[PDB]
Amino acid sequence: HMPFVNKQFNYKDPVNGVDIAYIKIPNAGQMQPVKAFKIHNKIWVIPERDTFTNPEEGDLNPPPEAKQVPVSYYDSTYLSTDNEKDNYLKGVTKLFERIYSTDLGRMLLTSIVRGIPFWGGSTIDTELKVIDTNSINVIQPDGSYRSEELNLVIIGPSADIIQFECKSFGHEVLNLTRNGYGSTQYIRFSPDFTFGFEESLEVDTNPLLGAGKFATDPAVTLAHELIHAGHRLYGIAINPNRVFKVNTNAYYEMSGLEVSFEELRTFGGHDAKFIDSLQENEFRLYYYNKFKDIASTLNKAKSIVGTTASLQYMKNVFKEKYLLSEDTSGKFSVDKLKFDKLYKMLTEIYTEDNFVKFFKVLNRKTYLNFDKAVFKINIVPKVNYTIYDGFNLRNTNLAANFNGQNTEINNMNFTKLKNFTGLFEF
Ligand code: NA
Ligand code: NA
Ligand SMILES: [Zn+2]
């Protein structure tokens, strides 16, 4: 197969205003343009810490120690130099290639590219219009800006390098992630850090035990985030306020811990069964009705605004995205069989637990565990990590028994930065 990222970018490559360009994000201020890299149709990478997407997060300096929460890690200097940004680009590229090298990742990335956020921007119900927050503004060689629609942007982490807990992370663009429309996703991610987990379920799900012997493959972490992005691009994410008041783990239960249904869905495996079957049927009916609303909007559309593109070219983009049926009079409708397949593909087939099987890596067995440790890594050298094998390199002592993920055996590949065990209020 042909690679997912066709250009091996170096951070210092000259801007060209096309796939290497200074850009601005909608709704951020008169931010200084940032240098960004288009790695695939609809997908950009910004090798900067995210001081833009959310107004409440602008400084990278660590809080006072007495304010910091235990599962957190700060490093204000991370991703501030050209060499780091170069390594970041190469690391993220390699992980997209590792994902795309599996049939499951091919399926997911294809769904992501086809998941163009719906043109529901118009005030007038017969007019088809892009929503502005679903684009970026790209500086051209002549110094002018052009608006470019995109689906996904990978960006560096904000102040807290390891990011949110057991509910939200993608963020909400009004109801766009939940009303069938979809919206452009900004994923905070770093290929330069990973976390440790424990190989025994009794230990991994206990807040008091384990130092984090095994390292999570960061391809699984990126796949996890891309699965959320898939839900959000198709507008079928579950409101983070729909949660499981965990009562299957004594330690979660005594601390009143809650996990969003969206996280359980995204992990898959046995976790998804904790989504009450009645609430899941309700969700499905809800999303099915949102899709019907979209078919209706396209059926009523006489005109298109912005764009030089055809009213029919764009009607067909969304017919393809949502797998709509078209009758003899050109009317669009939602087919129940096809909705069931699309919804299932996005929520049951694309799961963390399924990616673990395709990568043949060791991984947490449930989302309902406790983090153990965070490590510094470098996956760019092929002597450290490959597209095909991750850390578990063929023809080395690391090929068998997940030895490459074993931070005790493969110790030169991990630098432990912080332990989380014993910090949890128990
Ligand atoms: Na798993
Ligand atoms: Na070490
Ligand atoms: Zn998640």
From Swiss-Prot:
It comes from the Bacteria. The active site is at residue 225. It is found in: Secreted; Host cytoplasm, Host cytosol. Signal peptide: none annotated. Has protease activity. Has proteolytic activity. In vitro the whole toxin is reduced to release LC. After translocation into the eukaryotic host cytosol, LC hydrolyzes the 197-Gln-|-Arg-198 bond in SNAP25, blocking neurotransmitter release. This is Botulinum neurotoxin A light chain. It comes from Clostridium botulinum (strain Hall / ATCC 3502 / NCTC 13319 / Type A). The gene is botA.
